């Protein structure tokens, strides 16, 4: 903000009617302090707290020490008493740019005394002068007319602790709205025809995204089948619909003759294309044996699945080992 309100006049500005991307906003990364006591937008990038407000105010450097929960004293008592249990973080950085000095702009005063400390959530914007214990005063140079608003160290300052910090508290005191406005907008690229874990607007699922010809309605976002299982998802970043299917999901059967006769065996992968069989078992096992059965010259495809280690033959014989779909395997040459 070009102009920052004083601590005594901190504004409870709220943010809504849009979706934000904290990652882009964090390009500067000039914040001096990071005190987070919850699911912060920086710490957590998959939530959209609704009742989130960015308090636009400026405080002196030392006051940064008193921006903790349940804090009391000076700023925490009279100027800005944050909620005792506030969900959010406190951000403070030393700029001293708008003030035109390294000491502190005089306009950034801070209320004090008044014998009335703030509540954890209330504000007492008022220009009234502190009342004396013998005769009321409201200005001039009467009896104990001390101005509650005291200017910062406009004179030269040595330590940063006595300088104006553009401190904004990202406290979100959600009451009835779980999440409507997003601070962080973490996102990745798009992958198709590959088994991956996808998170679309909080819907998490493992599958192979593929281009879909379904024509979802403009308001419609997700899709489902008669079984009440997701089978199509719309890209939130573009008017595109992608299907969802299990990655491979097969079973392994060992077509083996009697060990008293031979030891070589065949492997059947249920209802999976042979092209995916090498990746089906990851081919990460011990180099011989399994790898030989992972793929090879003798690979056959059938309604049952992919058979490796058996040589397809035109000749038809009696069913020796039942594989399925009217197809059987035998050890005979």
């Amino acid at each position, epitope marked *: 903000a070009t102009r920052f309100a004083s601590v005594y006049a901190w504004n409870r500005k709220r943010i809504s009617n849009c979706v934000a991307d904290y990652s882009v906003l964090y390009n500067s990364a000039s914040f001096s302090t990071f005190k987070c006591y919850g699911v912060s937008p920086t710490k957590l990038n998959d939530l959209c707290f609704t009742n989130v407000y960015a308090d636009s105010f400026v405080i002196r450097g030392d006051e940064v020490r008193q921006i903790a929960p349940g804090q009391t004293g000076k700023i925490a008592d009279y100027n800005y008493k944050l909620p005792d249990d506030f969900t959010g973080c406190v951000i403070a950085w030393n700029s001293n740019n708008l003030d035109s000095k390294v000491g502190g702009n005089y306009n950034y005063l801070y209320r*004090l*005394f008044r014998k009335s400390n703030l509540k954890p959530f209330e504000r007492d914007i008022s220009t009234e002068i*502190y009342q*004396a*214990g*013998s005769t009321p005063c409201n*200005g*001039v*140079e*009467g*009896f*104990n*007319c*001390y*101005f509650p608003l*005291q200017s910062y160290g406009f004179q030269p300052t040595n330590g940063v602790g006595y300088q104006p910090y553009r401190v904004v508290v990202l406290s979100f005191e959600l009451l009835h709205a779980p999440a409507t406005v997003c601070g962080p907008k973490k996102s990745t690229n798009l992958v198709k025809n590959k088994c991956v874990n996808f998170n679309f607007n909080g819907l998490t699922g493992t599958g192979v995204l593929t281009e879909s010809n379904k024509k979802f309605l403009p308001f419609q976002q997700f899709g489902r089948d008669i079984a009440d299982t997701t089978d199509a998802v719309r890209d939130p970043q573009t008017l595109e619909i992608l299907d969802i299917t299990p990655c491979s999901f097969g079973g392994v059967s060992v077509i083996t003759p009697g060990t008293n006769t031979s030891n070589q065996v065949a492997v059947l992968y249920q209802d999976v294309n042979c092209t995916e069989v090498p990746v089906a078992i990851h081919a990460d096992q011990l180099t011989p044996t399994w790898r030989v059965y992972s793929t090879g010259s003798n690979v056959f495809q059938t309604r049952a699945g992919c058979l490796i280690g058996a040589e397809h033959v035109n000749n038809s014989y009696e069913c020796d080992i039942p594989i399925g779909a009217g197809i059987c395997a035998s050890y005979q040459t």
Partner: nanobody
Amino acid sequence: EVQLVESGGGLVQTGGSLRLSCALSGYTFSIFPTAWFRQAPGKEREFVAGIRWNGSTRDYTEYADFVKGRFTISRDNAKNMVYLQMISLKPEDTALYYCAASDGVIDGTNANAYRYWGQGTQVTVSS
């Protein structure tokens, strides 16, 4: 640490005049008010005089009724020091004088609220 040093006082004939100096260091004396108190044998500590810097145009001075119209108090922020001028002194004025300052702005008559107190100096008035 905040240090307050009092100088002046001594023995003076009744009806004379005196000047007490209080030098304060270790804090911002310009804005926080400074109060002069006197403690006499058998008497507690009560407000005697005070000076405050409202910050707008002038320094306000408060004087106790029993010494009103005779005691003057002034503050020099550049020198961070306080003058207390007394005229037409009386025998009852014999006492130990302290000068006190506060870490913040407080009521002038609130002696206890003054978190800083100096050693002080003895003043005696003889007929």
